[PDB]
Design an enzyme around this catalytic site. Structure first.
Site, mmCIF file in Angstrom:
data_model
loop_
_atom_site.group_PDB
_atom_site.id
_atom_site.type_symbol
_atom_site.label_atom_id
_atom_site.label_comp_id
_atom_site.label_asym_id
_atom_site.label_seq_id
_atom_site.Cartn_x
_atom_site.Cartn_y
_atom_site.Cartn_z
ATOM 1 N N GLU A 126 -75.046 -82.541 -0.377
ATOM 2 C CA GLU A 126 -75.016 -81.212 -0.964
ATOM 3 C C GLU A 126 -76.191 -80.850 -1.853
ATOM 4 O O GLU A 126 -76.382 -79.717 -2.279
ATOM 5 C CB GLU A 126 -73.823 -81.187 -1.900
ATOM 6 C CG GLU A 126 -72.535 -81.417 -1.111
ATOM 7 C CD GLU A 126 -72.198 -80.211 -0.282
ATOM 8 O OE1 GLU A 126 -72.753 -79.140 -0.385
ATOM 9 O OE2 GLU A 126 -71.277 -80.406 0.591
ATOM 10 N N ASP A 160 -74.934 -70.747 -0.327
ATOM 11 C CA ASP A 160 -74.829 -71.925 0.498
ATOM 12 C C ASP A 160 -75.224 -71.603 1.896
ATOM 13 O O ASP A 160 -75.626 -70.469 2.174
ATOM 14 C CB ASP A 160 -73.456 -72.551 0.328
ATOM 15 C CG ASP A 160 -72.415 -71.706 1.005
ATOM 16 O OD1 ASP A 160 -72.639 -70.677 1.575
ATOM 17 O OD2 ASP A 160 -71.242 -72.225 0.969
ATOM 18 N N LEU A 210 -68.414 -74.370 -4.740
ATOM 19 C CA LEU A 210 -68.254 -73.021 -4.310
ATOM 20 C C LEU A 210 -67.709 -72.169 -5.426
ATOM 21 O O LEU A 210 -66.741 -72.512 -6.096
ATOM 22 C CB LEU A 210 -67.339 -72.940 -3.097
ATOM 23 C CG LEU A 210 -67.073 -71.463 -2.774
ATOM 24 C CD1 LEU A 210 -68.360 -70.799 -2.267
ATOM 25 C CD2 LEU A 210 -65.860 -71.299 -1.853
ATOM 26 N N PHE A 240 -64.347 -82.012 1.597
ATOM 27 C CA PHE A 240 -65.046 -81.407 0.484
ATOM 28 C C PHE A 240 -65.875 -80.245 0.987
ATOM 29 O O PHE A 240 -65.996 -79.210 0.379
ATOM 30 C CB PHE A 240 -66.126 -82.391 -0.017
ATOM 31 C CG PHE A 240 -66.842 -81.926 -1.262
ATOM 32 C CD1 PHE A 240 -66.458 -82.343 -2.534
ATOM 33 C CD2 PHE A 240 -68.047 -81.237 -1.162
ATOM 34 C CE1 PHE A 240 -67.191 -82.022 -3.675
ATOM 35 C CE2 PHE A 240 -68.752 -80.839 -2.303
ATOM 36 C CZ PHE A 240 -68.327 -81.218 -3.569
ATOM 37 N N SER A 263 -59.076 -84.671 17.039
ATOM 38 C CA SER A 263 -59.936 -85.743 16.575
ATOM 39 C C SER A 263 -59.203 -86.625 15.615
ATOM 40 O O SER A 263 -59.461 -87.799 15.488
ATOM 41 C CB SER A 263 -60.939 -85.188 15.586
ATOM 42 O OG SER A 263 -61.799 -84.288 16.255
ATOM 43 N N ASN A 281 -65.582 -85.763 20.312
ATOM 44 C CA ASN A 281 -64.699 -84.634 20.023
ATOM 45 C C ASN A 281 -65.115 -83.856 18.795
ATOM 46 O O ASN A 281 -65.156 -82.640 18.674
ATOM 47 C CB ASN A 281 -63.256 -85.166 19.802
ATOM 48 C CG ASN A 281 -62.227 -84.056 19.710
ATOM 49 O OD1 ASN A 281 -61.890 -83.511 18.660
ATOM 50 N ND2 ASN A 281 -61.858 -83.533 20.846
#
Ligand code: CL
Ligand code: CL
Length: 162
Positions: free
Chosen positions: A11, A20, A32, A104, A117, A132
């Site tokens: 990040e 972002d 965020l 996250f 998945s 997948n």
């Protein structure tokens, strides 16, 4: 390597409000702030999260503080999800870091619709899960990061993080 270092790598860290990759106001270590397009709502949200009039800028310590709480919240979110918990508890520690990273980044929400998945990871069909997982908007919008998380799930090692 651990979750913080892995996510701090994915990040980055910025102390001034930023947009972002989806164009949403964020700050710190991928925190965020709001989905709204009003910078003002964003700053209000920031002040509220930090506890003071920030004027869109925070300190490293404040950033790390928000990061700590966000990692915490992500894991708790996983632990509280009936579809997620069982998968997560079946994985080894490296792969658990890969699960936290996805949550996250995309929320409990985003991740909860990766049903196929998830099933594959639970059955320990690594390569299958890996193919997948790539069939997703997540991978197509942020391929370099998605590649690193996917390799982590596929191999159980930190090699993508070198
Ligand atoms: Cl907060
Ligand atoms: Cl990326």
């Amino acid at each position: 390597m651990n979750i913080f270092e892995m996510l701090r790598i994915d990040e980055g860290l910025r102390l001034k409000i930023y947009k972002d990759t989806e164009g949403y106001y964020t700050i710190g270590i991928g925190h965020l702030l709001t989905k709204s397009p009003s910078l003002n709502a964003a700053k209000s949200e920031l002040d509220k999260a930090i506890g003071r009039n920030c004027n869109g800028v925070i300190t490293k310590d404040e950033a790390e503080k928000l990061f700590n709480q966000d990692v915490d919240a992500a894991v708790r979110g996983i632990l509280r999800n009936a579809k997620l918990k069982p998968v997560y508890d079946s994985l080894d520690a490296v792969r658990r870091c890969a699960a936290i990273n996805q949550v996250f980044q995309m929320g409990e929400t985003g991740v909860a619709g990766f049903t196929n998945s998830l099933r594959m990871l639970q059955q320990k069909r690594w390569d299958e899960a890996a193919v997948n997982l790539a069939k997703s908007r997540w991978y197509n919008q942020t391929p370099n990061r998605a590649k690193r998380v996917i390799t982590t799930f596929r191999t159980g090692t930190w090699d993508a993080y070198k």
